[PDB]
Amino acid sequence: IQAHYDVSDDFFALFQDPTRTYSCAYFEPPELTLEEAQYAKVDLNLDKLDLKPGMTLLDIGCGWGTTMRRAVERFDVNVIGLTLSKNQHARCEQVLASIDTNRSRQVLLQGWEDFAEPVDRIVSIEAFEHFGHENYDDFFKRCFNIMPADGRMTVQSSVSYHPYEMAARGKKLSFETARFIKFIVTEIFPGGRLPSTEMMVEHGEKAGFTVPEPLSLRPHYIKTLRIWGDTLQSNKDKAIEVTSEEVYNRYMKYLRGCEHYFTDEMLDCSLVTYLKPGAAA
Ligand SMILES: Nc1ncnc2c1ncn2[C@@H]1O[C@H](C[C@@H](N)CC[C@H](N)C(=O)O)[C@@H](O)[C@H]1O
């Protein structure tokens, strides 16, 4: 049943950029291409982490390996990536092995749950939606515990608003948004759950982290989703051929719907920074 909403890598290749990044890009400056903006998003995350040569960076949910490789290349760090996909695992291995570096590089097919080795810094870009609210305490506790005194982590995640906050916008739109969120979390990220930004901040605080004001990426996700959607739609027949009209329609619903709900400010995307007590200034 969870395996039903699994789709082949070749479908995603029909809307994503060459880096295969499956998360909000960063159009700064606005004229960047999707691919460029995916790299700008990687940098935006990594630049907040106080990475020094010879550190070990952990990528939780490392996808196809772009973040890790960019970190090795820019920061001359060791890396370790965690992924739940065997295909991502095999590709990441290739991406990592081909880097001209003496730094250590490792990809593991496992969750953060089973990861407990010392790392200096943590990046997690839109894996958090999969974890479920019941695991937030354990996630933050693990991330706090594996890092040294000056550790830092970024988590980037799509977020929703509490039903109470949504109600301020009127019942109609509020119930309609909740249904669409339920759809995201059934058919796009099965077993998933969108946090609110408050939940992201507060669980981090409870674990002991200092949490500055989160960065909103809402207009960047709008641009991202627009390009993703326009691109899927243009590759429609190729999409249907490799999957079905069903699966095509599902992702168009997702992509258009999210853009719509982002434009309406009924969804957000937060880049939250977590600083251990001894983190540098
Ligand atoms: N418990 C977990 N531990 C580690 N990775 C996970 C977990 N749950 C989901 N993921 C991964 O999180 C990733 C989710 C993607 N949305 C983001 C991938 C990547 N960071 C990107 O920006 O492209 C996929 O690699 C999933 O396998």
Burial class (CB in 10 A: 0-12, 13-18, 19+), 261: buried
Instruction: Yes or no: say if 139 and 82 are a contact pair by the CB < 8 Å rule.
Output: no
The coordinates were experimentally obtained by X-ray
Contacts of 14 (CB under 8 A, 6+ apart): 231, 232, 235, 238, 239, 242
Question: Two tokens at 151?
Answer: 């550790």
The alpha carbon of 53 and the centre of ligand 1 are apart by a number of angstroms equal to 25
Residues 73, 56: Cα–Cα separation, whole Å: 13
Nearest to 153, CA basis, from 116, 122, 117:
122
Contacts of 281 (CB under 8 A, 6+ apart): none
SS3 71: helix
Q: Is 259 in the pocket of ligand 1 (CB under 6 A)?
A: no
Q: End-to-end alpha-carbon separation of the chain, Å?
A: 47
Residues 14, 248: Cα–Cα separation, whole Å: 11
Whether 92 is a known active-site residue: answer no
The dihedrals phi and psi of 83, each to the nearest 5 degrees, come to -145, 155
Pairing type for strands 215-216 and 152-159 reads: unpaired
Among 7, 43, 62, the mutation site with the greatest number of ligand 1 atoms within 8 A of its Cβ is: 62
Resolution (A): 2.3
Domain with 117, as residue range(s), is 1-281
Q: Is 183 in the pocket of ligand 1 (CB under 6 A)?
A: no
Residue nearest to atom 4 of ligand 1 (CA): 111
Residues 149, 9: Cα–Cα separation, whole Å: 39
Q: Residue 52 corresponds to which amino acid?
A: K
Read off the CATH number of the domain in which 16 is found: 3.40.50.150
Contacts of 174 (CB under 8 A, 6+ apart): 163, 166, 167
Alpha helix positions (H), 55-196? 66-75, 86-97, 136-146, 163-167, 171-183
Helical pair 34-46 and 66-75, crossing angle rounded to 10 deg: 60
Nearest to 145, CA basis, from 127, 119, 124:
119
- Residue 262's H or E segment, with its range, is helix 245-263
Q: Is 84 in the pocket of ligand 1 (CB under 6 A)?
A: yes
Helical pair 245-263 and 218-234, crossing angle rounded to 10 deg: 150
CA dihedral 36, 112, 76, 24 (to 10 degrees): 10
Nearest to 184, CA basis, from 159, 163, 156, 164:
159
Q: Residue written as tokens 């490792």?
A: 106
Number of domains in the chain: 1
Is 83 labelled as part of a ligand binding site? yes
